[PDB]
Amino acid sequence: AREITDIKQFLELTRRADVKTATVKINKKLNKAGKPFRQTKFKVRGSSSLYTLVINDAGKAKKLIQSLPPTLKVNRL
Amino acid sequence: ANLRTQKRLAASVVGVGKRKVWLDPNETSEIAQANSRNAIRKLVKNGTIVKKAVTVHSKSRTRAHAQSKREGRHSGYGKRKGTREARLPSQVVWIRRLRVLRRLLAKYRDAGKIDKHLYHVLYKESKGNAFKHKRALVEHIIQAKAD
Amino acid sequence: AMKKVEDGNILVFQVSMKANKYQIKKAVKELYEVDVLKVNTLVRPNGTKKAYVRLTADYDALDIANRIGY
């Protein structure tokens, strides 16, 4: 229900002591004037709100996954 | 048998009315054994129950008739049942024309072709039914500027 | 009612007409040593009250139903 755009803020939410679950969604969509690319959405389940971070760079996306805390339960697709 | 309840369940499951549900007349025994909605879904999957197509309501003649009207046909005195006001209100015609005239006067004044003093005179003449269309106003402006 | 036990993890009871949801939740915990997520109740057309008691995920309604005797 809420979207965040700052990656530094995203990491703070993942260790907020009330977050237990998260999911990663992959979307195959097209860009403005080119061939389709890969879009990934990182969703953090808070107590009262769901936070969504969307990044359209696949190279920058893989680094975010490796940086997620291990204690967080992550759901794939 | 009595398949009244099977047809009702099939219509709800498929999502159409009971008039669009077809039950296989050669599969009465297996249809009678389908009491749940899960069993109805299986019968739809294997073709025992099918959804009939909608009855066609073509608009081919409507489209062809509309094309004839766009060419000026079927518009004589023998085809009119309402009054001229009922077909097209005279107030609607007036509002279109006055908005056309006022839109042109503002365009010319902004473009610098007409000063505000001549604009004000022509503003109240158009309101006074002086000009019958846009062409009459443009010609009047040319004559005023030519003198 | 039995379909709600193994599928919905919900126990169905007939309760007294004078009992509210607070008392129903307390009675189930004391009698059966389980945790109650929520209670839904209705008054049946025959004049008796029926309660839908859903247990938490930490308990299985089917195991509790077998222990009771049904």
Place this chain on the structure above:
Amino acid sequence: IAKTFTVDVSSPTENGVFDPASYAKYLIDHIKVEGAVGNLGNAVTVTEDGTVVTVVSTAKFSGKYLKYLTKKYLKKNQLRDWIRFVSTKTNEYRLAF
């Protein structure tokens, strides 16, 4: 830009009741370009190899038009009861027996 449409006729041809050459000739004299037929002035080109019929056009052409012409060809030869025009993926079609 140009668009390419391919029709797979392998299955009907293997039986022997279908002729890709005759079907390819039907599309030459029945495609209308900006009006009537016979206006394939370097706009519509159809090529066959015995198993796949490939149509390349730069004018107004669509999959619905290709299926409409194919169904007319199948009905003319009385093949509708056995052969069906099916779209496998985008702009790639095949005939099912």
Place this chain on the structure above:
Amino acid sequence: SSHKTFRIKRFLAKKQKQNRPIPQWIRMKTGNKIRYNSKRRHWRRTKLGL
């Protein structure tokens, strides 16, 4: 109607339970003269009038 007070619903509940045939085994008791329920009610014939 769907909107009904508790008193009306409780009244309707009792009338439903009283509308049943007499058990068969009762007619076999010693000195029994009761054959059929003389207070049977049908919703379309006789109205409750509450």
Place this chain on the structure above:
RNA sequence: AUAUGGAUUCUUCACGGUAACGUAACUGAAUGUGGAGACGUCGGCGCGAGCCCUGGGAGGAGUUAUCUUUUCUUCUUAACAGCUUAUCACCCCGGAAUUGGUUUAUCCGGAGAUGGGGUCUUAUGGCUGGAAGAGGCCAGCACCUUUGCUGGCUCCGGUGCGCUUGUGACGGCCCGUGAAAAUCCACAGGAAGGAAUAGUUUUCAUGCCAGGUCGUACUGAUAACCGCAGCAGGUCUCCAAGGUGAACAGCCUCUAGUUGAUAGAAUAAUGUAGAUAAGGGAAGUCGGCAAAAUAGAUCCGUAACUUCGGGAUAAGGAUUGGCUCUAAGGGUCGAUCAACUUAGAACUGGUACGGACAAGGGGAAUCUGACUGUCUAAUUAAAACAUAGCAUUGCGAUGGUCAGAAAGUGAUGUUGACGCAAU
């Protein structure tokens, strides 16, 4: 219930903007003031939503003797959240007759217009999150089976005196000016409480707990209600597709729903209901009762009388199809794009054309009530009642008219002679 983060304080209770005012926050008791709740009806105009119509493309289905790049169908996006979006209104600069601006509708300006630059309400719309993982449409595989598995696509536009509905700014009308309260907020006020080795803010953010009781099925009517009944009666309301046409008219169709009302055979008289008639045309009859004639639209033409508003569609005439063309009436920026409106001309036919449906007979006078309105539910709708207008009567409150067994009792009266009451 409470903690952390943020904000604030050594100038103790925040800063920016000329201003309209802006913000993540940014002490406020008694008491007081203000706002919201909170409001008629009709008319046109602007805008939004759903629906309707329609172009390209990706799928499925129908038709195919012949014709039809064709006919039908799927292509969807909730509450909520972030950013953004406005007619009206307001602020700053400036100082107007050669008066300007401006609405379909004539209103505004030295009590500051036009113009340039700003601020604000968020009805409403746009993008994103919710959210494709859902739903929808197809294709390829397994198979008594608990029944699934794997794939694709779900896209981009146009149009308006359209329909329904919401809403905004205005205008018309009244001897009619079209509820109340619970409840929530703001302001004025300054009682108190508060900092330096420390505190306050739960009107900023995040986190924790709980939310009882009763109703909830179904019919909603030519079979579930009331009329003695499964009675052609009676019974409040929301949603509303295409064509014809002025139209929620009549007539035909799509979605959805029904195909129910004892049947079969025959076709006498008399009926009930629907119709047609040669010549005459009210001679019928208490009486033109009933029926017939007239009928839409466009153009022409229209008397006596009159309270000058009417009479009036007075009366009385002409025209109307189909087809092929022509002229005029627009938007955005020479070019390019898009609406049905009206007028006219050839050609064509068994002279037909509001071709079904739909749809005024008219005129000259007398009696009577001015008009619209109202009543004898179940035999009388009228000339009867009412009405505006006119006149008369009573009364200045310790009062007039009227109520009550009584009353430390009431109606007019939340009233005061331009009033109330009685004819």
Place this chain on the structure above:
RNA sequence: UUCAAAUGAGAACUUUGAAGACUGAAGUGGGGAAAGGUUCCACGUCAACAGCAGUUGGACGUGGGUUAGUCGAUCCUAAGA
């Protein structure tokens, strides 16, 4: 209204399929207020009831079914009591 099949001791009237039609969006469509009170749903079943018929039913017999912090009541006041 018609043809065929299925069921049954028995079919103009039940079920399914096919055909012909109607309501024609101010409906014979889709929801409700009042009123009714289990008529709702499944299984079993036809003596009586459905002014013919009946294997069908709003009939007869036995069971099943109405889940709310957010929809209403509850709270407020209106004429009035």
